[PDB]
């Protein structure tokens, strides 16, 4: 419960919608790595941990267990379902926002339950593509998640975002704005 | 209205004072609940609700399996730590300190800094000010930064320096931003 | 090298 | 333990050969080997559930291996030759690629002729 | 990680038979695996073991401090101890192989 450092090598994460899966490292909180299951090959998140390698394949049999004992659980519990949480929607900035220079945007959506979710961002109704990125689910100690995710922008007084979040646990999608002032 | 289940096994690995103490908690988790887990302090599998109990039972009277996972401690734990000990825990990003009115407030943001031991110190005229501050939490980016807000509430005359101090493992001598009315 | 835990088949789905 | 049938297998060239095994109970890693002498034990393929995570290994596109199950495993030969004829072994350990231990079955002495 | 072993070897039954095995180049990872295979059928399991010393109803395995030697003991040969002895370093990542082994005689 109390250490200096908790790392998780790794989380194995499987479920029956999809189905789908997810195996990652966490040290400190922050995801190492992920694998692509469908490519079958390991993503970095941090430039220093490129210089490893992590075979795939423990990845991909270690869900190919985690489908089976899923399985298991779910007939052992006469099929008790998940429980749709109220996700935790929260938007920032990255740095102090300034009109000429660039900054990005972090949309943090927290206490996700079941980890299944679509994070958009929008102005002005439009979507944006172009400079999106996200995090893996990352795990809690409650055994919940959260996942982050990143728009680069070039603030402007006139250009306001909205972080469209889709869960099961929201009666409608989440718009959370970010006014530049 | 769709149906999830959810299963999680996660491999955690508990540190302190560097090498000295290490602890593996394997969870295995069925949706939000941990049913099951092997603990290397106790040294086997043991129920923590009686959905895990079969498993506790199944797992524990393979001598081939509990010794596999009382091998993991080193297996996993001490040799993956030896890898942070040159990559992730070598990993120090110094902090952007930054002062801007939000005047009654004195906004110092703390931005893009690694690792989370952090401590920021308000000062009007090298006094210590505390009773009108408020802080954020410590916020969590995701991109392996962190991120802390420390508002004052002031009321500023001529001759008022609003100082902010922050400390990090980082930096060699205290970072001290200023700021005049 | 990063090495994984290993999670054990549940009795017996 | 592992079980595996036809025991003995002769057949004519070009004729197709169906393989199984029967691995432990409990046991979600199911291996399929083949052994000639003077030779040693040579790899062909592996399941953890009803996937095969290592396709590589399989002497042509004439074998292929199955287990819908994910229990029972079925090894097919089609079109069989001279170069196929060997002992077919079967293991099954707990779990894939976690130094579990690899119990074999009896094998199945295919012999082909021309 | 390769494992080494005599050719052959003729032991007399109702005593233990002490075969030896080496492997210098063992990684921490790596169990010291034991099959036997009688001609010619399925490889048997006999024992194995990480650093500690292990005991069967088969046999006992003694690996050294170092643990770049090993020993399996029969603890009272037989016949049915005639048989082609595997000692293998095995490991998660790689796939069971077998080496020359040591080829058990046990005369009468």
């Known amino acids: 419960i109390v250490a200096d450092h908790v790392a998780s090598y790794g989380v194995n994460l499987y479920q029956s919608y999809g189905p789908s899966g997810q195996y990652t490292h966490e040290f400190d909180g922050d995801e190492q790595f992920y694998v692509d299951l469908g490519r079958k090959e390991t993503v970095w998140c941090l430039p220093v941990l490129r210089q490893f390698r992590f075979d795939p394949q423990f990845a991909l049999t270690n869900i190919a267990v985690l489908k089976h004992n899923l399985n298991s659980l779910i007939k052992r519990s006469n099929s008790t379902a998940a429980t749709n949480e109220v996700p935790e929607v929260t938007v920032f900035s990255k740095s102090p926002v300034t009109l000429g220079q660039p900054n990005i945007l972090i949309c943090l959506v927290d206490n996700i339950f079941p980890p299944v979710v679509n994070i958009t961002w929008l102005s002005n109704g439009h979507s944006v593509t172009e400079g999106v990125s996200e995090t893996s689910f990352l795990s809690k100690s409650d055994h919940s998640f959260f996942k982050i995710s990143y728009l680069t922008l070039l603030p402007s007084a006139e250009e306001s975002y909205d972080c469209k979040v889709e869960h099961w646990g929201l009666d409608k999608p989440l718009l959370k704005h970010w006014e530049p002032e | 209205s769709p149906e999830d289940f959810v299963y999680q096994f996660k491999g955690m690995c508990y540190f302190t004072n560097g090498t000295e103490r290490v602890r593996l908690v394997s969870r295995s988790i069925y949706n939000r609940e941990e049913i099951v887990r092997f603990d290397s302090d106790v040294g086997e599998f043991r129920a923590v609700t009686l959905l895990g109990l079969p498993a506790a039972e199944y797992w524990n009277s393979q001598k081939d399996i509990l010794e596999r996972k009382r091998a993991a401690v080193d297996r996993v734990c001490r040799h993956n730590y030896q890898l942070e000990l040159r990559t992730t825990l070598q990993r120090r990003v110094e902090p952007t300190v930054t002062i801007s009115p939000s005047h009654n407030l004195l906004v110092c943001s703390v931005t893009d800094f690694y690792p989370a031991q952090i401590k920021v110190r308000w000062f009007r005229n090298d006094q210590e000010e505390t009773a009108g501050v408020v802080s954020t939490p410590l916020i969590r980016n995701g991109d392996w930064t962190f991120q802390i807000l420390v508002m004052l509430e002031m009321t500023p005359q001529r001759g008022d320096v609003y100082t902010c101090h922050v400390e990090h493992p980082s930096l060699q001598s205290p970072i001290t931003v200023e700021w005049r009315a | 090298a990063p090495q994984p835990e290993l999670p054990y088949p549940q009795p017996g789905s | 333990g592992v079980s595996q049938s036809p025991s003995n297998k002769v057949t004519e060239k070009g004729k197709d050969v169906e393989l199984r095994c029967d691995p432990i109970?409990?046991?979600?890693?199911l291996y399929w080997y083949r052994q000639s002498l003077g030779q040693g034990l040579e790899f062909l393929i592996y399941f953890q559930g009803n996937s095969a995570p290592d396709k590589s290994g399989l002497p042509s596109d004439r074998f292929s291996a199955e287990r819908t199950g994910g229990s029972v495993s079925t090894l097919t030969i089609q079109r069989t030759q001279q170069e196929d004829s060997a002992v077919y072994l079967c293991?099954?350990?707990?779990?894939?690629?976690?130094?579990?231990?690899?119990?074999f079955g009896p094998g199945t002495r295919l012999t082909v002729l021309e | 990680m390769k494992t080494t072993q005599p050719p052959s070897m003729d032991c007399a039954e109702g005593r233990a038979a002490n075969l030896p095995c080496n492997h210098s180049?063992?990684?921490?990872?790596?169990?010291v695996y034991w099959y036997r295979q009688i001609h010619s059928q399925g490889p048997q399991y006999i024992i194995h073991?990480?650093?500690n010393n292990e005991t069967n109803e088969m046999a006992s395995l003694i690996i050294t401090e170092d643990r770049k030697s090993s020993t399996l003991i029969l603890p009272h040969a037989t016949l049915r101890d005639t048989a082609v002895y595997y000692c293998?370093?095995?490991?998660?990542?790689?796939?069971?192989?077998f080496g020359q082994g040591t080829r058990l005689t046990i005369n009468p």
């Open positions: 073991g990480l650093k």
């Open positions: 293998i370093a095995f490991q998660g990542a790689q796939k069971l192989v």
């Open positions: 109970s409990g046991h979600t890693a």
């Open positions: 180049t063992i990684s921490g990872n790596e169990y």
């Open positions: 293991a099954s350990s707990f779990r894939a690629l976690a130094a579990d231990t690899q119990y």
